[PDB]
Amino acid sequence: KTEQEDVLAKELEDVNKWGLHVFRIAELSGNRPLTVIMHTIFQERDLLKTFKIPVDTLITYLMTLEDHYHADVAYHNNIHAADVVQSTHVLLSTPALEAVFTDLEILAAIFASAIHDVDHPGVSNQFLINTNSELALMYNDSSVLENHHLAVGFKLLQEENCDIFQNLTKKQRQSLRKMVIDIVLATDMSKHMNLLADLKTMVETKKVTSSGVLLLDNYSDRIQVLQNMVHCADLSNPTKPLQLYRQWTDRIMEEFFRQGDRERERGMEISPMCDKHNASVEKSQVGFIDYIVHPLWETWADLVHPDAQDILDTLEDNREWYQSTIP
Amino acid sequence: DVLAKELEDVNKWGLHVFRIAELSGNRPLTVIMHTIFQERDLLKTFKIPVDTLITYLMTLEDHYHADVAYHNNIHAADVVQSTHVLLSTPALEAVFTDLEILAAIFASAIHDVDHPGVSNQFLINTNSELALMYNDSSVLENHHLAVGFKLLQEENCDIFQNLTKKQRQSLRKMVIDIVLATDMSKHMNLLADLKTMVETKKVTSSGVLLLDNYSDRIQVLQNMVHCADLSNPTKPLQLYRQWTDRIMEEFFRQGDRERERGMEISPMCDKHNASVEKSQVGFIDYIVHPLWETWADLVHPDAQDILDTLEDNREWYQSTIPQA
Ligand SMILES: COc1ccc(-c2ccn(CCC(=O)N3C[C@@H](C)O[C@H](C)C3)n2)cc1OC1CCCC1
Ligand SMILES: COc1ccc(-c2ccn(CCC(=O)N3C[C@@H](C)O[C@H](C)C3)n2)cc1OC1CCCC1
Ligand SMILES: [Mg+2]
Ligand SMILES: [Mg+2]
Ligand SMILES: [Mg+2]
Ligand SMILES: [Mg+2]
Ligand SMILES: [Zn+2]
Ligand SMILES: [Zn+2]
């Protein structure tokens, strides 16, 4: 749903697959990967018809949302947003979750993924706190960027011909709003340990039908699975085909080193992994996997067993790549 | 003058704050904060220039709204002064650092600044910019904090300028934790934990509370400022009556806006159907007494007189309500 001069349709055939080449999509779409992928998912899940979303309204909002991801930020840009959307889209389709979620809950998870880093400045919450930024002042040092991402994502609905939720009922809007806020605030890394703990508890008390489909009894259960799902998608780089992962790693190091440069310039202690003069990119990816990504994904794999087995296997193959390339 | 005479009672529960408002040219927050900072020797302890302090206070007080009947500068001054009294409760003697004392008092002063006179729920329900900015979570309390700290940036307003970097960071953290605890949606959880704190509390031989970690310390300051926020019905009846007038005027004005917007009118906000007596009794019964009873437990017997007044005031408001 954007001028492309190409196609693009061949690549988009993998939109239902892990390891869709999102960088290729960005190139082929004129750097509109978020609009393209979102538009394709909404058509495929029939969400326009279900929620009576005018298509030109959808594309107008997406283009505006995409414009508020910063082009000069190496990792937290429209491609990452497109990536987390598409990954969530795939996770939602997992067999163990078949017919578990409503169309509104599906819509919430996808919308949340799309806005979850919008207007990201390329620095961390802690950098913003430490430098007494207006944003950290606004949000009292609490989930500073995640609060902002939500505010922007919802505020953009008010731009001309941009309110994709105009035909939701008041109650639907309220519920969707609550769910999106819950999901995006859960992408705050400071909540990771708590989220994982609660995911492990969920796995332990897992209930499945005969077909091995999860049974969730209430909002707490459903929102918790959605929170962890989008958190998994946000943390999915190392579980992707290696060539994708390698580029994601290049981008986050570029973004991190730029923060470190800002810290160095202001005589601040340089943050962990943000010192380009003293970095161990490969070692850092292995620690990332060992202490953050594998624990999470092993637990997700548990919840949806064996739906996520190949992802766990790739994660292990990718861990070995970076291991084998430590100098 | 007469103001200096009224301010002699600044260390006592039931200070006539309305009188101080009148006599100070409607600057109760400024004069009471100044008085308390002198009293506790805060300017000396924290190298705060008096011209700075006053400049900040006047700006802060200007940012309370004149046309808001309850949530204005008089309420701010009242919570400041009540917190100030509670801090000096015997059970808490030499428990808190001067920084923690500064944090509680500063928190109280800013805790409702720029209040628009309507509730969080109203702001959420009318899709306000404030609720949009803060994702429906502690909407006004986040706002109060942001504005309160932001005013420090004004010309000659930075009263913390001579705090060490660690001091400023610690103070900022404590003030945030305290003002967020004034969100009513956290009341039951705060109360629930306070009861458990009380159940397991430790005291020295001298009878003073022992609070070993930050979690316990801030928990007590959170509930202290929450009690001061909720202290109207524990005051002499002449004062309590005026507070009741004001909150009802404020609530009915919110109800008027809700009616004009075709919205369901919020509980106790309909000028046509509300009973002040029934409302205040319910307020004491389900919110104020359960909290103050727990506070009185914590510091027993320090708060018994406060609790007695509360129970008298309850018995009083319920006397004109027919009952079986
Ligand atoms: C391909 O590499 C990464 C991809 C993603 C992340 C990562 C960690 C947490 N998230 C979740 C979102 C989040 O909360 N943040 C908060 C902030 C701490 O930085 C993160 C970047 C964003 N994402 C980390 C990656 O690498 C590590 C960072 C230095 C090398 C190891
Ligand atoms: C003198 O009367 C009152 C004085 C104070 C309060 C009161 C309740 C909660 N607080 C704590 C601060 C707060 O959180 N809020 C959130 C909002 C719900 O309304 C309150 C206004 C403020 N303060 C209530 C009083 O009574 C109400 C009028 C009808 C009976 C109830
Ligand atoms: Mg193919
Ligand atoms: Mg983020
Ligand atoms: Mg369950
Ligand atoms: Mg308040
Ligand atoms: Zn992200
Ligand atoms: Zn208040």
Is A39 known to sit in a ligand binding site? Answer: no
d(CA B243, CA A58): 50
Nearest-by-Cβ selection for B149 from A137, A150, A185:
A137
Q: Of A233, A235, A248, A257, nearest to A321 (Cα)?
A: A248
Q: Ligand 2, from B111, B184, B225, B284: best to mutate by most atoms within 8 Å of Cβ? A: B184
- Interface probe with A: pick from B114, B135, B161, most Cβ of A within 10 Å: B135
The atom number, within ligand 2, closest to the CA of B141 reads 14
PDB resolution in Å: 1.9
Q: Of B26, B18, B102, nearest to B58 (Cα)?
A: B26
Is A76 known to sit in a ligand binding site? Answer: yes
In chain A, what residues touch B160 (CB-CB under 8 Å)? none
Owner of token pair 């749903």: A1
What domains does chain A contain, in order, with CATH numbers? 1-327 (1.10.1300.10)
Nearest alpha carbon, ligand 2 atom 20: B119
Owner of token pair 């988009």: A12
Tell me which of B34, B63, B65, B71 is the catalytic residue: B71
Sign of the CA dihedral running B80, B85, B90, B91? negative
Q: Of A86, A87, A70, nearest to A78 (Cα)?
A: A70
CB burial of residue A99 (10 Å; 0-12, 13-18, 19+): exposed
Residues contacting ligand 1 via CB (< 6 Å): A 124, 187, 189, 234-235, 237, 248-249, 252, 256, 273, 284-285, 288
Residue B36 burial (CB count, 10 A): 24
DSSP3 helix / strand / coil % (chain B, rounded to 5): 65, 0, 35
Q: What one-letter code names the amino acid at A59? A: I
Residue B35 burial (CB count, 10 A): 20
β-pairing, B209-210 with B202-203? antiparallel
Tokens of A202: 């969920």
Cα A164 to Cα A215, B33, B275: the distances in Å are 30, 50, 44
In chain A, what residues touch B135 (CB-CB under 8 Å)? 147, 150-151, 181, 185
Expt. technique: X-ray
The atom number, within ligand 2, closest to the CA of B183 reads 14
Is residue A49 less than 8 Å (CB to CB) from chain B? no
d(CA B290, CA B190): 12
What HEC string does chain A produce? CCCCCCCCHHHHCCCCCCCCCHHHHHHHCCCCHHHHHHHHHHHHCCHHHHHCCCHHHHHHHHHHHHHCCCCCCCCCCHHHHHHHHHHHHHHHCCHHHCCCCCHHHHHHHHHHHHHCCCCCCCCCHHHHHHCCCHHHHHCCCCCHHHHHHHHHHHHHHHCCCCCCCCCCCHHHHHHHHHHHHHHHHCCCHHHHHHHHHHHHHHHHCCCECCCCCECCCCHHHHHHHHHHHHHHHHCCHHHCCHHHHHHHHHHHHHHHHHHHHHHHHCCCCCCCCCCCCCCCHHHHHHHHHHHHHHHHHHHHHHHCCCCCHHHHHHHHHHHHHHHHCCC
d(CA B298, CA B220): 9
Cα A317 to Cα A205, A238, A242, A246, B174: the distances in Å are 30, 9, 8, 13, 46
Tokens of A21: 């080449």
Residue A281 CB-half CA count within 13 A: 17
Cβ atoms of B179 and B111 within 8 Å: the answer is yes
Tokens of A147: 């609060």
Cα A283 to Cα A248, A255, A279, B115: the distances in Å are 15, 18, 9, 51
Total CB pairs under 8 A between chain A and B: 32
Is A307 known to sit in a ligand binding site? Answer: no
Cα B63 to Cα A173, B30, B68, B115, B151: the distances in Å are 34, 12, 11, 9, 9
Cβ atoms of B112 and B75 within 8 Å: the answer is yes
d(CA B229, CA B227): 5
H/E element holding B202? strand B202-203
Q: Ligand 2, from B247, B279, B285, B289: best to mutate by most atoms within 8 Å of Cβ? A: B247
Q: Of A73, A88, A25, nearest to A235 (Cα)?
A: A88
**B132–A151 C-beta distance less than 8 A:** yes
Following CA atoms B42, B47, B49, B54 in sequence, which dihedral angle do they give, to the nearest 10 degrees? -30
